[PDB]
Design a protein around this ligand. Structure first.
Ligand SMILES: CCOP(=O)(O)OCC
Ligand SMILES: [Co+2]
Ligand SMILES: [Fe+2]
Length: 328
């Protein structure tokens, strides 16, 4: 009975089960869902859509998602409690900062960031009492000077509390390596850290370099492909031109090289998206109507059929998430 915090309260680690470890109920901005609920039709329409989508993943075998929306992704922890109950799926919430932090965060020192993250982990997000169970952090290239601070503060808050840290990278620019240097300079154990979006590159030199050091490797955009959408300039920059299979192969690729224990797999999916072009979410829904059941329905059986054994895939979808989220 080691235990982790979800938006409905504590749970036993061993009940986390099949866990998608990089997901979003809604990709937004701080204060936005409350200032402009209609952007999304309504708070009510959004919740109902999350709920339908999560019951879908849940039918498919998913029991937990980790919602890595930070303050600046507009994390609404009330909405997460409310879809979590309605759909009967555990949702682990996040602290940390993504790459859209407002001036109130950007003016802060490493010491004050660390107080902010610890607050959300140890006391509760906002006035709610709901505790973040993962720390989210981000670079898009060389870490900006403020990003260095967030990363060091992320590492301190993790050593204090034992909550894992997880990251956004621009994977083509091999951010994970800097990211790891910064965390390591703070004494953080690589097995407390997941380097995310790593399925955005096919650079296995890069990926096995991280895995070999003990980092978890987040293969977390499985359904993101813009094949057949070549005249959709915003779809392209976001989805890329590699297929879902090409991504799913990375998983086998690491398993064949002995790195089964260092993989986490997810969709980086959402049910609403205000922080990009208008209607991106219709686009997304056409390219992947399965939303967050895409991994269990498409990716696992594809792995099974390329000869990956079931015990191995269990270790990836259950054991690794469990090892990772377990406060250490
Ligand atoms: C919250 C949305 O931000 P992102 O995860 O970087 O975007 C990928 C959909
Ligand atoms: Co991201
Ligand atoms: Fe994300």
């Amino acid at each position: 009975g080691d235990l982790i915090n979800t938006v409905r309260g504590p749970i036993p680690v061993s009940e986390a089960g099949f866990t998608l470890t990089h997901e979003h109920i809604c990709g937004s901005s701080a204060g936005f869902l409350r200032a402009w609920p209609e952007f999304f039709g309504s708070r009510k329409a959004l919740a109902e859509k999350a709920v339908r989508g999560l019951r879908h993943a849940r039918a498919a075998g998913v029991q937990t998602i980790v919602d890595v929306s930070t303050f600046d992704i507009g994390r609404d922890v009330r909405l997460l409690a409310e879809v979590s109950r309605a759909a009967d799926v555990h949702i682990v919430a996040a602290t940390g900062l993504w790459f859209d932090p407002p001036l109130s965060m950007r003016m802060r020192s490493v010491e004050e960031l660390t107080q902010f993250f610890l607050r959300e982990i140890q006391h509760g997000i906002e006035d709610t009492g709901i505790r973040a169970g993962i720390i989210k952090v981000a670079t898009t290239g060389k870490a900006t000077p403020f990003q260095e601070l967030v990363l060091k503060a992320a590492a301190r808050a993790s050593l204090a509390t034992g909550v894992p840290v997880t990251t956004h990278t621009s994977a083509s620019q091999r951010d994970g390596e800097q990211q790891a240097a910064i965390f390591e300079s703070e004494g953080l154990s690589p097995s407390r850290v997941c380097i995310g979006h790593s399925d955005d590159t096919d650079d296995l030199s890069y990926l096995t370099g991280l895995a070999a050091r003990g980092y978890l490797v987040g293969l977390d955009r499985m359904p993101y492909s813009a094949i057949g959408l070549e005249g959709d300039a915003s779809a392209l920059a976001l989805f890329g031109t590699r297929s879902w299979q090409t991504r799913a192969l990375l998983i086998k690729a690491l398993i064949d090289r002995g790195y089964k224990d260092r993989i986490l797999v997810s969709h980086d999916w959402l049910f609403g998206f205000s922080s990009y072009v208008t209607n991106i979410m219709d686009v997304m829904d056409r390219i992947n109507p399965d939303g967050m059941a895409f991994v269990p329905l498409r990716v696992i059986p594809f792995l099974r059929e390329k000869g990956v054994p079931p015990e191995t895939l269990a270790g990836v979808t259950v054991a690794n998430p469990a090892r990772f989220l377990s406060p250490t």
